[PDB]
Structures are given as C-alpha cells and as structure tokens.
Amino acid sequence: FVNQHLCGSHLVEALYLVCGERGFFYTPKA
Amino acid sequence: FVNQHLCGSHLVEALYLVCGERGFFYTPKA
Amino acid sequence: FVNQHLCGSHLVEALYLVCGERGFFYTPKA
Amino acid sequence: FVNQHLCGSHLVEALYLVCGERGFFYTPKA
Amino acid sequence: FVNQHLCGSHLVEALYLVCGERGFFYTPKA
Amino acid sequence: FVNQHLCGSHLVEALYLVCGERGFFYTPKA
Amino acid sequence: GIVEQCCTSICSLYQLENYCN
Amino acid sequence: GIVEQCCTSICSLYQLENYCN
Amino acid sequence: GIVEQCCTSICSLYQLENYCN
Amino acid sequence: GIVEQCCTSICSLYQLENYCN
Amino acid sequence: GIVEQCCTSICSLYQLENYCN
Amino acid sequence: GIVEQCCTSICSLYQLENYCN
Ligand SMILES: [Zn+2]
Ligand SMILES: [Zn+2]
C-alpha cells in the first residue's frame, strides 16, 4: 500500500473504505 | 431541506457536509 | 449546521444533497 | 464515448464534467 | 482491513486509494 | 464539451465516465 | 440505526445532526 | 426525463449536453 | 454567484437552498 | 474478473493490490 | 503523462479517451 | 489529529485504521 495526502471529504471516504463495517470516528478537533 | 435515500459512502459524505469541523461518529449495525 | 469551502464537483454534490427532488441550477457565470 | 448507467449523485457528477463552467440545470421528475 | 462491496465508480476510487502513484489498470469484463 | 483541471481521484472518476466498459489505464509515472 | 434507516428507508439532514460531535 | 432515463435505462454524454447552459 | 459565496468565501447549507428550483 | 467479483460478491484491498502497476 | 496534461494543465474529454483500452 | 497526519502530512492506509472503532 502507498502513502498520500487525504483532505476533506476525500479523507472520510478513505475512512469508510478502511473501517467499513467496524465504523469510525472523524474528529478534526483532536 | 429534503428527505434523502443515502447508502454506502454517500451517507458518510452527507455526514461530512452536515457536521463539518464538529466531526462525527459513523456507527453501522453489527 | 456549519459553514465550509465547497469547490468544483464537491459544490454540486452539496447542491444535490440540499435540493434533492426539487432540482437545482448551477450557474458559475452568474 | 460510451453509454452510461448513472443514478443519484453520479448523474450530477457527469453533468459537471460535461458542462463545466457553462453550468447546467438538474431537473428530476415530479 | 475489511471486505468491501464495491460497484461502479466506487471500485475505481478504491483502486486509486490502494495503488496511489503506482498507478493501476481497470479492466471490466467483455 | 469543455476543458478542465482534473486532479487526484477526480481525474480517475473522469476516466471511468469516458472509458466505461472499455476500461482504462492510469499511469502517473508515464 | 441511522445508517440502516437512511438506506432501507429515508432520513433527513436534521436526523443526521444527531451524530455530529 | 433525462434524470430518469439515465438510471432506469442508459444515456450518452451527448444527450447530457442538452442540459448544459 | 454561488462559486464566489461558497467556494472563494464560505457558505451555509441554507445559502445553498437559494439555488434550488 | 475483479471488477465483477467486488460487485456481485465481495473483495478485499489485498485482492485489489494485484491490479496496481 | 495524463497528470501533466489534465491536472497541471487542462484537457478535454476527448484527450481522456486516449487512456482508454 | 487525523487531519495533521493525513491531510497536512501524508499517511498510510494502516494509520487510518487507528480511527476505526
Ligand atoms: Zn454510488
Ligand atoms: Zn476534491
């Protein structure tokens, strides 16, 4: 697998693909 | 606003547009 | 709801989500 | 170009790529 | 990582996130 | 049809729309 | 859940706000 | 309409140009 | 336009509803 | 193919790596 | 490449068809 | 955060799994 710049909605689509059924949390304030 | 039929990654997009920087939790069923 | 920067195709996807069945118009020339 | 089966937000994406800056009107049925 | 049900343009997105700069070949069936 | 700037995943979604069933190749190294 | 309701049935943006942090 | 035809059946990019401003 | 208010500057989901038919 | 398997059934990211250049 | 012609510079939908198999 | 590691800087698909529940 490779490394990339993931910003905005592109970043959460990546989170959806990786986590899938497990679900995930998006906390930019963290 | 109107009612929407959101499935798959289209739902996480909608969450990102509604919550923005506040962040959000995606928790699908087991 | 929050405020954001929406550009390009990301902007029309937002228009689709907000307008839905009502339809919408994208006129950058305006 | 080829024929495509476009539904939901995938249709507005295709409109944005074809019309570009010319803009376009999205008018689904009542 | 988890198993995913990818159709249409959602599959090319997943390919882009996995392959990145390495590039990839999209070859659907005849 | 018009001309535009297509970068990242937006570029491969365009390739999917134009090529469709023919398939395509994304080779940034080229 | 909200994830299932939006896809089997329909949901509103106001319902989706219940999931913002 | 074009919105319904593309989804129930199929449409071409040339048909979609009929909707550009 | 919508681009100067939402892309260059920032806009709310409510401002986007002004472009709905 | 991989394109059909992912959509009719399911596929993993590891299977998709077989298609990177 | 496709990136230098479509991302850095601008390209038409016709130029994108050169990358189709 | 996830934004400073994946957006500002670059991150791998493995680093994204730390944000999965
Ligand atoms: Zn879809
Ligand atoms: Zn983008």
Smallest CA-to-CA distance from A6 within C3, L20, E13 is with E13
* Nearest-neighbour CA in chain I from C19: distance (Å): 5
Are J20 and F26 in contact, with CB atoms under 8 Å apart?
Answer: no
Declared resolution, Å: 2.0
Smallest CA-to-CA distance from E20 within L16, J12, J21 is with J21
The 10 Å Cβ neighbour count of residue A20 is 17
Say which experimental method was used. neutron
* Nearest residue, CB atoms, A4 vs list E3, E4, E20: E20
**Contacts of residue L17 in chain E, CB cutoff 8 Å?**
1
* Nearest-neighbour CA in chain C from I20: distance (Å): 4
**Contacts of residue F16 in chain E, CB cutoff 8 Å?**
8-9, 12, 26
**Residue with the two structure tokens 């390739």:** F15
Token code pair at residue G19: 């999931």
Distance C23 CA to ligand 2 centre (A): 23
Distance E9 CA to ligand 1 centre (A): 7
A30 lies in which domain range?
1-30
Q: Which chains touch B (3 or more CB pairs under 8 A)?
A: A, C, G, I
* Nearest-neighbour CA in chain E from J14: distance (Å): 9
| Contacts by K12-19, CB closer than 8 A, 24 or more apart | K12/F1, K12/F2, K12/F3, K13/D1, K13/D17, K13/D18, K13/F1, K13/F14, K13/F18, K13/H13, K14/F1, K16/F6, K16/F14, K16/F15, K16/F18, K16/F19, K17/D1, K17/F18, K17/F19, K19/F15, K19/F19, K19/F24, K19/F25, K19/F26
Secondary structure (H, E, C), chain D:
CCCECCCCHHHHHHHHHHHHHHCEEECCCC
Tell me, yes or no, if A21 comes closer than 8 A to chain J by beta carbon: no
Number of compact structural domains in chain A: 1
Q: A3, E17: Cβ pair inside 8 Å? A: no
Give the ligand at the shortest distance from the Cα of F5. 2
For chains I and A, tell me whether 3 or more CB atom pairs sit within 8 A of each other: no
Q: H7, D8: Cβ pair inside 8 Å? A: yes
* Nearest residue, CB atoms, F1 vs list D2, D4, D18: D18
CA–CA gap between residue H12 and residue A23 (Å, rounded): 37
